[PDB]
Paper text:
Instead, new virions are extruded via the phage-encoded pIV protein, which has homology with bacterial secretins. pIV is a secretin family protein, with sequence similarity to bacterial secretins at the core of the Type IV pilus assembly machinery and the Type II and Type III secretion systems. Fifteen f1 pIV subunits assemble to form a gated channel in the bacterial outer membrane, with associated soluble domains projecting into the periplasm. The C-terminal domain integrates into the bacterial outer membrane and forms a double-walled ß-barrel with a central gate forming a stricture at the centre.
We present here the cryoEM structure of the closed state of f1pIV to 2.7 Å resolution, the first near-atomic resolution structure of a phage secretin protein. Averaging the protein particles together in 2D showed that f1pIV particles are composed of fifteen identical subunits; no variation in symmetry was observed. The N-terminal part of f1pIV is comprised of two periplasmic N domains: the far N-terminal N0 domain (residues 1–88) and the N3 domain (108–172), which are joined together with a 19-residue linker (89–107). The fifteen subunits pack against each other to form the secretin channel, with each subunit contributing a four-stranded ß-sheet to the multimer, culminating in a large ß-barrel composed of 60 ß-strands. Within the ß-barrel is a smaller inner barrel comprised of four ß-strands from each f1pIV subunit. The inner ß-barrel is angled parallel to the pore axis and provides a scaffold for two extended loops that reach into the centre of the pore, known as Gate 1 and Gate 220. The interface between the outer and inner ß-barrels is composed mostly of hydrophobic residues, and strengthened further with a salt bridge between Glu 185 and Arg 337 (both residues are highly conserved amongst homologues). The interface between neighbouring N3 domains is mostly hydrophobic, and no hydrogen bond interactions are observed between them in our structure. For reasons of flexibility, the extracellular part of the ß-barrel was missing interpretable density (36 amino acid residues, positions 199–234) as well as the very centre of the pore in the Gate 1 loop (15 residues, positions 275–289). The far N-terminal N0 domain and its associated 19 residue linker region (residues 1–107) could not be observed in our structure. Two molecules of CHAPS were observed to bind to each f1pIV subunit, forming a circle of detergent around the barrel.
Residue numbers in the entry:
A (entry chain A): 108 to 134, 140 to 198, 235 to 274, 290 to 308, 310 to 369, 378 to 403
B (entry chain O): 260 to 274, 290 to 308, 310 to 369, 378 to 403
C (entry chain B): 108 to 134, 140 to 156
Write the structure that this text describes.
């Protein structure tokens, strides 16, 4: 016998090309010097004569991907309490609106995991176990030919002021999926729209109390995703 | 080689206690190639909260962990998060006549950039 | 012997096509380089 040569890996870390090169030489024989991105291989000369042309099909320039999450929640809302005690006449007309646009972003090499997490680290009784509660996006993209296959988890959480339980209640919003994106496309990775039209009315079919409530909540959440190959 | 910088506070967290750095930290593991650099990177920017809503201490977290490919003197957007909250509220009357109205327009943007340079 | 070639997978992740390709070659011989969606196979 076996000669031992060193090969300079130019485009990828030499450490990732150990298993692949362990096969080419199979019939520890491959090692990586991480400092100067080198592969030291020991194998018959014949085998080691063809290794140059295998490392030109396996040591290629990897692409970087820019995933760009988009969370969007619009909540409208109204109400109309209306008493008519008989002559006190209470009323109310509460409106409400809300637009939250959270745009997380993360660049990662193809075939690598990347995560962004911005929020709060909160302890949760289980003995305690800490846990991130805020916006996070974990990605694992793989570019192909361009297309991207993307395993994605987007979580948008917050803490609640409710003390109705043992510990702390969190407001959750999560999607986890795998999708297929083109090189500069936006997909609806998911969503939830919601609509509540409550209405109430106690009456009389000498005092004459005669209330009436109403409500018309409407909410919509969208989760979009745009991936872009950087090259 | 691995290198890390950590500036902040070392805070004990109940788990029995386990101490843990809470501040700015950056752990790197770069490999230069031919020039290009492949960089496994974790940047954490954390702080302590004054909230006593839970068992122990709440921390304000901000972290990126990725692997990217940088040239010899380039800056990349290793990641980020922009946020926008436009809340609006309005109780009225459709004898007293209370008639409040709240509003809010928070906007926030975080960027995490990274520049690697081969010294030789 | 066995030659070792690399195949570019275009439509699906190359990692899902390891068991399937392990059968075609059966008679670790198949590996996936996840970065550039490639299958390195060693077989006659
Ligand atoms: C108000 C924004 C406008 C977004 C836009 O104009 N374009 C997309 C890219 C956004 N960027 C991340 C580049 C900008 C961020 C600002 S940054 O600060 O990052 O520069 C978004 C939020 C909700 C979006 C609609 C809903 O989903 C429903 C539906 C889904 C379909 O699928 C496409 C059509 C449709 C009607 C959507 C249109 C549009 O999309 C809307 C209005
Ligand atoms: C405009 C689009 C199309 C249509 C399709 C389904 C419709 C809703 C549903 O019908 C349920 C509900 C019935 C109530 O009675 C009135 C309110 C509500 C929320 C409707 C409102 C609206 O009309 C929707 C969104
Ligand atoms: C105010 C600074 C200026 C930075 C600058 O002028 N150049 C970069 C190198 C910084 N240094 C570390 C050398 C200086 C530190 C001072 S020291 O004390 O270390 O000497 C930074 C902070 C936010 C930056 C923008 C955003 O990201 C969005 C966007 C991303 C693209 O990617 C590039 C374009 C753009 C528009 C950015 C431009 C610029 O970049 C900004 C204004
Ligand atoms: C200037 C850039 C381009 C555009 C693209 C998406 C836009 C925002 C979204 O539309 C969500 C939201 C809707 C509200 O109604 C008004 C406020 C807000 C925050 C918009 C502000 C602004 O216009 C943005 C950043």
């Amino acid at each position: 016998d076996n000669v031992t040569q060193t090969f300079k890996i130019n485009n990828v870390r030499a450490k990732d090309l150990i298993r692949v090169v362990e096969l080419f030489v199979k019939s520890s024989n491959v090692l990586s010097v991480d400092g100067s991105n080198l592969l030291v291989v020991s194998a018959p000369k014949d085998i080691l004569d063809n290794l140059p042309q295998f490392l030109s099909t396996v040591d290629l320039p990897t692409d970087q991907i820019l995933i760009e999450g988009l969370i969007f929640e619009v909540q409208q809302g109204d109400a109309l309490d209306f008493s008519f005690a008989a002559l006190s006449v209470r009323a109310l007309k509460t409106n409400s609106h809300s637009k939250i646009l959270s745009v997380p972003r993360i660049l990662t090499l193809s075939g690598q995991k990347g995560s962004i997490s911005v929020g709060q680290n909160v302890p949760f009784i289980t003995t305690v176990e800490r846990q991130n509660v805020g916006i996070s996006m974990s990605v694992f993209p793989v570019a192909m030919a361009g297309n991207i296959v993307l395993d994605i988890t987007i979580k948008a959480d917050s803490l609640s002021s409710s003390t109705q339980a043992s510990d702390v209640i969190t407001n959750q919003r999560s999607i986890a999926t795998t999708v297929n994106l083109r090189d500069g496309q936006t997909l609806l990775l998911g969503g939830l729209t919601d609509y509540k039209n409550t209405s109430q009315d106690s009456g009389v079919p000498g005092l004459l109390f005669s209330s009436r409530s109403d409500s018309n909540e409407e909410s919509t959440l969208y989760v979009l995703v745009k991936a872009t190959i950087v090259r």
